[PDB]
Amino acid sequence: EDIQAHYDVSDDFFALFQDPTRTYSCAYFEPPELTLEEAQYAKVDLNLDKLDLKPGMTLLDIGCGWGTTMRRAVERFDVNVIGLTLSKNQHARCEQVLASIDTNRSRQVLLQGWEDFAEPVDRIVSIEAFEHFGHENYDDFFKRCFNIMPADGRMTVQSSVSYHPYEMAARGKKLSFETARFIKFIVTEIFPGGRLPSTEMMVEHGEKAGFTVPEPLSLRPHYIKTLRIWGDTLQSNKDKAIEVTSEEVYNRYMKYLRGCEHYFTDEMLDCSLVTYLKPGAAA
């Protein structure tokens, strides 16, 4: 409780390694020559383009961050938006981002989890929403998402994933134990109290709730590029980053960024964009 609170880091630190949109998730470098900022917009479009969004629909963003996804949805698809965040700072920024949009569409941001959310919505997006998707309870999550959507409902969940210990063992015990200890570090110091799901968990929990689940998209090569730029950017701002936090916090995040790039390159971690289609989803 108070132990986890030790790993609280101010928004200002994240600004010193992230692109100007402050997107804390895997970018999408298509085409490959996109800047990180351009690739973060490409990742939002990759997710939204899977959701069959029509004007006047309501999109739910579970873990709406700084509001980039919701704004893009309103602008591109002329939809109403509801965002869920557990960050007071993100809630405030999202309200101002949405209010700034020239639209008559409904825009709402709620300081709550999905557990408490029970309003009808047409489509759902959730992009590396650690505070929502990082504490298991997957049967309740997929049941909620299924039940709040209409017959043609669709959802995307983008999540960092690990492999089951059995699958990790296949690459040899040395690398399996090493990866398992690095994952423990991630869910202790970077995403405290977290549980990193597997792609198989993401798929099978969706299917149990009644969703059709096509082949998940691996973003592995995109996360390698994202983490390389994040790491290189943090290192370039070392003095600034240490001033705002400490040498401890700087070393912690360089370990996270360099470490994740390594285990992604070694195919011991992955990032899955999973699509969940209700039985009546358009073909």
Ligand X SMILES: Cc1ccccc1S(N)(=O)=O
Among 114, 191, 211, 223, binds ligand X (CB under 6 A): 191
Whichever of 188 and 233 has its CB closer to ligand X, that residue is: 188
Report the 10 Å Cβ neighbour count for 205: 23
Q: Is 193 annotated as a binding residue?
A: no
Q: How far is it, in rounded angstroms, from Cα 34 to Cα 46? A: 14
Min dist. Cβ of residue 89 to ligand X (A): 18
> Site mask, ligand X, residues 87-126, x = CB under 6 A?
----------------------------------------
Q: Is 26 in the site for ligand X (CB under 6 A)?
A: no
CA distances 119 to 29, 47, 60, 77, 81, Å, are 35, 22, 10, 20, 12
Q: How far is it, in rounded angstroms, from Cα 169 to Cα 156? A: 30
Q: Is 64 annotated as a binding residue?
A: yes
CB 33 within 8 A of CB 98: no
Q: Is 226 in the site for ligand X (CB under 6 A)?
A: no
R_g (Cα) of the chain, nearest Å = 19
Which segment (114-122, 129-137, 200-208, 249-257) binds ligand X by CB under 6 A?
A: 129-137
Q: Is 159 annotated as a binding residue?
A: no
Among 67, 83, 134, 231, binds ligand X (CB under 6 A): 134
Q: Is 66 annotated as a binding residue?
A: no
Catalytic residue IDs: 260
Instruction: Provide the β-strand partners of residue 220.
Output: none
Burial of 33 (0-12, 13-18, 19+ CB in 10 A): exposed
Q: Give the residue ranges of the annotated binding site for S-adenosyl-L-methionine.
A: 24-25, 63-65, 85-90, 114-115, 127
Q: Which residues bind ligand X (CB under 6 A)?
A: 128-130, 133-134, 159-160, 186-187, 191, 194, 196
